[PDB]
Amino acid sequence: PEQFRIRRDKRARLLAQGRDPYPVAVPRTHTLAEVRAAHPDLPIDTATEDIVGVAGRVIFARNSGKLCFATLQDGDGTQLQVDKVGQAALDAWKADVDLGDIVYVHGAVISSRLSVLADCWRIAAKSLRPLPMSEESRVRQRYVDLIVRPEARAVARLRIAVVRAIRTALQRRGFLEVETPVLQTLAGGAAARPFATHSNALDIDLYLRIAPELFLKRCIVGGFDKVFELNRVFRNEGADSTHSPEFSMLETYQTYGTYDDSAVVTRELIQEVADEAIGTRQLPLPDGSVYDIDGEWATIQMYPSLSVALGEEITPQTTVDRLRGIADSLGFGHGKLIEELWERTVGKSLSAPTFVKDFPVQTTPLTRQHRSIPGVTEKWDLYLRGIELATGYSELSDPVVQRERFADQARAAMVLDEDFLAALEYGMPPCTGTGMGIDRLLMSLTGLSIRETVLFPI
Amino acid sequence: PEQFRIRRDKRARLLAQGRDPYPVAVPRTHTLAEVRAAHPDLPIDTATEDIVGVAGRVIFARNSGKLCFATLQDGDGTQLQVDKVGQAALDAWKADVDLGDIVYVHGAVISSRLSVLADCWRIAAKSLRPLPMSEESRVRQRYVDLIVRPEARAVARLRIAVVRAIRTALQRRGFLEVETPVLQTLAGGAAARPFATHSNALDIDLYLRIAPELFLKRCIVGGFDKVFELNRVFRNEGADSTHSPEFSMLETYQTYGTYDDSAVVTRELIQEVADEAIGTRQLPLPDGSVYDIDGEWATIQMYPSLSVALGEEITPQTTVDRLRGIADSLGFGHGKLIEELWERTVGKSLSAPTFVKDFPVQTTPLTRQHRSIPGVTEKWDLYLRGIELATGYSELSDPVVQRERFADQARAAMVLDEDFLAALEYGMPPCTGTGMGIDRLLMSLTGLSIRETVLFPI
Numbered sequence: 001p002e003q004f005r006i007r008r009d010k011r012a013r014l015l016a017q018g019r020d021p022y023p024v025a026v027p028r029t030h031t032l033a034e035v036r037a038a039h040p041d042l043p044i045d046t047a048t049e050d051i052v053g054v055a056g057r058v059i060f061a062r063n064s065g066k067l068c069f070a071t072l073q074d075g076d077g078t079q080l081q082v083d084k085v086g087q088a089a090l091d092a093w094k095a096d097v098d099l100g101d102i103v104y105v106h107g108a109v110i111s112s113r114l115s116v117l118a119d120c121w122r123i124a125a126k127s128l129r130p131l132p133m134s135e136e137s138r139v140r141q142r143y144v145d146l147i148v149r150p151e152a153r154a155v156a157r158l159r160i161a162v163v164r165a166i167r168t169a170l171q172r173r174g175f176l177e178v179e180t181p182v183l184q185t186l187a188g189g190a191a192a193r194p195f196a197t198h199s200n201a202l203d204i205d206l207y208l209r210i211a212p213e214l215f216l217k218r219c220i221v222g223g224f225d226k227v228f229e230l231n232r233v234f235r236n237e238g239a240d241s242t243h244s245p246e247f248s249m250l251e252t253y254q255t256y257g258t259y260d261d262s263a264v265v266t267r268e269l270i271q272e273v274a275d276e277a278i279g280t281r282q283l284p285l286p287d288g289s290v291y292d293i294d295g296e297w298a299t300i301q302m303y304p305s306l307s308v309a310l311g312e313e314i315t316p317q318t319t320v321d322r323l324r325g326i327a328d329s330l331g332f333g334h335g336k337l338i339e340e341l342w343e344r345t346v347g348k349s350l351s352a353p354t355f356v357k358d359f360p361v362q363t364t365p366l367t368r369q370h371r372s373i374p375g376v377t378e379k380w381d382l383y384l385r386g387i388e389l390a391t392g393y394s395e396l397s398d399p400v401v402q403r404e405r406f407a408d409q410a411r412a413a414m415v416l417d418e419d420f421l422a423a424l425e426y427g428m429p430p431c432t433g434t435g436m437g438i439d440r441l442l443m444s445l446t447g448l449s450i451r452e453t454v455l456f457p458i
Numbered sequence: 459p460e461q462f463r464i465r466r467d468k469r470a471r472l473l474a475q476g477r478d479p480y481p482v483a484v485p486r487t488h489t490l491a492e493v494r495a496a497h498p499d500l501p502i503d504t505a506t507e508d509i510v511g512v513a514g515r516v517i518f519a520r521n522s523g524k525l526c527f528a529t530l531q532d533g534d535g536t537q538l539q540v541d542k543v544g545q546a547a548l549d550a551w552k553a554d555v556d557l558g559d560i561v562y563v564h565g566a567v568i569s570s571r572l573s574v575l576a577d578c579w580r581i582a583a584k585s586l587r588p589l590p591m592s593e594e595s596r597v598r599q600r601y602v603d604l605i606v607r608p609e610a611r612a613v614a615r616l617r618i619a620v621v622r623a624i625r626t627a628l629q630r631r632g633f634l635e636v637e638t639p640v641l642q643t644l645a646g647g648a649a650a651r652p653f654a655t656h657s658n659a660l661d662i663d664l665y666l667r668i669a670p671e672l673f674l675k676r677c678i679v680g681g682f683d684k685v686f687e688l689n690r691v692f693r694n695e696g697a698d699s700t701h702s703p704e705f706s707m708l709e710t711y712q713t714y715g716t717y718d719d720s721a722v723v724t725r726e727l728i729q730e731v732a733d734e735a736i737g738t739r740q741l742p743l744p745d746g747s748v749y750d751i752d753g754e755w756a757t758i759q760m761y762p763s764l765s766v767a768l769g770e771e772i773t774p775q776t777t778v779d780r781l782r783g784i785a786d787s788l789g790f791g792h793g794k795l796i797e798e799l800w801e802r803t804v805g806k807s808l809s810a811p812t813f814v815k816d817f818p819v820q821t822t823p824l825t826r827q828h829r830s831i832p833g834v835t836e837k838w839d840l841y842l843r844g845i846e847l848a849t850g851y852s853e854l855s856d857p858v859v860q861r862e863r864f865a866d867q868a869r870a871a872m873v874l875d876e877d878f879l880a881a882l883e884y885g886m887p888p889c890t891g892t893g894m895g896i897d898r899l900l901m902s903l904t905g906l907s908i909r910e911t912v913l914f915p916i
């Protein structure tokens with residue numbers, strides 16, 4: 001709080017002296033990891049003439065008369081420590097260097113009684129704020145978090161690897177990644193309230209996408225065989241531990257397969273991700289426990305599993321009056337009640353990775369009706385560690401069914417998405433699409449909160 | 459316009475008959491490209507017993523008594539044509555199939571007097587709109603465009619390959635891809651008017667990002683060595699042939715290099731992209747001409763090149779009164795005039811790939827001051843076929859300079875981005891960032907308009 005000002009004084013008295021505390025270029029020859037990997041086993045307390053120029057943040061200090069010692073930490077976490085050359089050097093070192101400062105050191109690498117002893121040295125950046133964190137002050141200052149807490153570094157890097165692993169996996173299977181509009185004249189593809197924004201260009205409101213599905217489906221019409229899109233969607237609603245207004249989401253579409261096929265791919269995908277990004281399918285948790293995601297995953301059906309849980313045959317024919325009865329005895333329409341009752345009974349119990357499939361028609365307007373069973377659609381949800389993570393559909397390609405479905409939805413709350421429906425009636429071949437939530441994915445894999453999985457939330 | 463209704467009648471009279479015109483699953487064993495690559499050279503008018511099930515859009519038809527012929531076109535453009543099995547089959551074929559329809563055919567592949575002769579056949583999707591386009595009706599119905607025009611297919615696929623090539627190139631060089639917020643409490647990183655939107659969660663306006671730079675720079679503070687982000691930005695301004703309110707943009711940041719270093723990388727990157735996505739650096743144009751992007755690219759300086767063009771020494775010292783004089787004699791502040799005069803004289807002439815570097819301080823608040831030359835910053839722009847495509851900076855890591863820079867900008871039009879400035883004063887190491895525009899990139903490579911480079915504009 002005071003040291004704020006002495007640092008700012010250290011800046012000004014360097015400019016006046018004509019020593020640059022924010023130089024344009026310092027000749028860093030090696031990352032610290034490069035130096036460590038280069039000199040793994042080294043005779044302790046012995047010299048080597050490998051001259052190198054390294055840089056890093058001075059995090060520890062121990063000044064002492066003729067020799068000074070400080071730990072240098074590169075941005076990724078790696079560490080190297082630092083008569084030699086000049087006395088004024090040491091004077092400047094003492095008087096100019098503070099903790100949190102970025103410094104360059106040229107010299108030869110030696111082994112401590114793994115350090116480097118300096119020919120030259122320079123400031124690369126002057127810190128006007130010493131380093132210190134509540135979980136919320138962590139999020140509001142991620143940049144400090146990443147500097148001073150290792151786990152922040154590992155989580156950031158893990159998200160990145162997971163996202164790369166996803167691209168790899170889909171690309172290996174012959175999927176093409178596409179960019180579809182964020183700004184739309186009307187936002188569809190999911191059930192949520194949009195963010196609205198006004199355009200100076202057109203003097204109209206546009207709406208940020210809630211999902212890419214409707215546009216992705218146009219691509220399938222247009223002759224894409226296999227397409228995906230990994231990017232942010234926007235749902236103007238409340239925040240909780242599994243919901244945020246902006247988050248990253250994966251949609252996948254594949255022609256000439258069903259929800260049976262996309263279920264297999266989804267499993268393989270998640271498993272292939274663990275392998276690449278985490279290295280095990282026996283997933284360690286902060287709990288201390290281990291979650292096993294290996295092998296095969298159980299598939300249940302919604303109506304039957306709900307039936308066993310309630311001890312009574314529930315079907316698509318079961319009335320809202322009856323459902324409401326059961327809803328009460330525990331604590332709008334048919335579909336909503338089935339999913340609610342199922343979630344409160346079956347989905348809450350689940351631990352092992354589980355698919356639930358065959359969903360009520362009311363609440364699934366974009367998914368095809370089931371091939372044999374009446375009253376249900378070909379949709380699955382994937383629960384992983386009790387987290388709704390992913391869905392897949394046998395996609396409805398029937399435009400007149402689809403027009404009805406929207407009309408039913410519109411009257412319930414009349415402007416339909418006429419261009420989407422127009423596209424469907426040029427002919428969309430049979431396909432299965434999936435959605436997956438990236439943070440929920442990581443959450444399910446790690447036990448980490450949504451406020452840790454993304455770099456910069458609010 | 460009438461045939462709209464006969465198609466819709468063909469749908470209904472199939473449902474009633476209990477033949478599904480939008481089946482969930484048809485067993486397509488092979489893409490058409492798979493069949494073509496399998497049977498390249500084949501004795502013409504001879505049989506082979508490779509049974510396969512293919513699917514595709516019936517685009518050509520020629521019905522004739524006992525044998526019917528139609529061209530099947532897969533979504534990517536590949537083509538295969540189609541006593542045998544059943545007469546009712548042929549009756550249904552004639553009466554049920556229209557152009558634009560998606561159809562499945564099982565049977566053996568044979569050579570035409572390269573077709574397939576049918577054991578079975580089924581409708582996969584019924585089209586209620588026959589296929590037909592003005593450049594604007596092309597954009598509003600991309601799905602039809604992609605079906606009926608080959609070039610639409612190739613451009614879509616090229617953008618995708620270019621974007622993949624970019625990720626490859628950066629990933630090869632050890633860059634990590636990061637997601638930074640689209641919704642911000644205040645949007646910075648470039649000069650443009652934001653899109654504003656209201657949050658129900660917080661009862662405040664948020665602003666869609668104009669650029670990721672300020673957040674990307676936090677990542678560098680936080681110890682990222684090499685980071686990029688390829689994703690859409692939003693600038694609430696007018697549309698023209700090189701400007702749109704939503705477009706895809708690449709930002710790159712690398713520690714311990716300057717604008718000299720990022721210039722080299724940018725060249726290599728663009729060149730490596732051409733190689734992967736296009737296959738030549740002798741770029742063919744709709745013109746008929748060829749643009750050469752191979753070898754080395756010229757670097758000029760703004761003030762000196764402007765000087766030669768005007769025949770008079772222009773420096774950072776040259777007054778607004780003088781500049782305005784020259785501006786008039788041809789046809790606000792110093793910086794703006796330099797760039798304007800330069801663009802109207804030098805930048806308009808350029809053809810070969812050219813870097814212009816060393817920019818006026820006023821108009822470059824985020825870039826470091828030049829290491830030796832006074833009055834200029836270390837910024838370059840890359841012109842490619844006379845298109846402003848890309849910039850790179852030696853990044854300003856000096857927080858007090860940076861605070862001033864914003865204050866000057868704010869007073870000109872007082873709320874600064876205090877958190878960004880806070881991050882800078884924990885110490886950002888020397889780095890160079892770049893921006894590149896994806897559509898301008900493709901435009902510069904191909905001669906294609908911005909309304910062709912993206913799938914779904916408006």
Ligand SMILES: CCOc1nc(N)nc2c1c(=O)n(C1CCCCCC1)n2CCC1CNC1
Binds near residue numbers: 243244389437438450
């Ligand atoms: C990390 C924040 O993720 C999410 N935030 C919000 N607001 N909404 C989200 C999510 C989020 O991850 N999802 C889903 C979850 C898996 C299904 C695929 C799409 C993503 N959804 C929608 C799920 C609804 C369907 N029943 C609840």
Ligand SMILES: CCOc1nc(N)nc2c1c(=O)n(C1CCCCCC1)n2CCC1CNC1
Binds near residue numbers: 700705846847895
């Ligand atoms: C395809 C549409 O691309 C763009 N649209 C808009 N509205 N603005 C764009 C673009 C667009 O591509 N760019 C730039 C061009 C290259 C520099 C890096 C960022 C991208 N910019 C900003 C450039 C200004 C700096 N002087 C003009």
Ligand SMILES: N[C@@H](CCCC[NH3+])C(=O)O
Binds near residue numbers: 435
């Ligand atoms: N838009 C969907 C994801 C794709 C499901 C398959 N069409 C959702 O948010 O639920």
Ligand SMILES: N[C@@H](CCCC[NH3+])C(=O)O
Binds near residue numbers: 849893
């Ligand atoms: N945000 C910049 C691109 C990055 C330039 C390097 N800091 C722009 O739009 O011009």
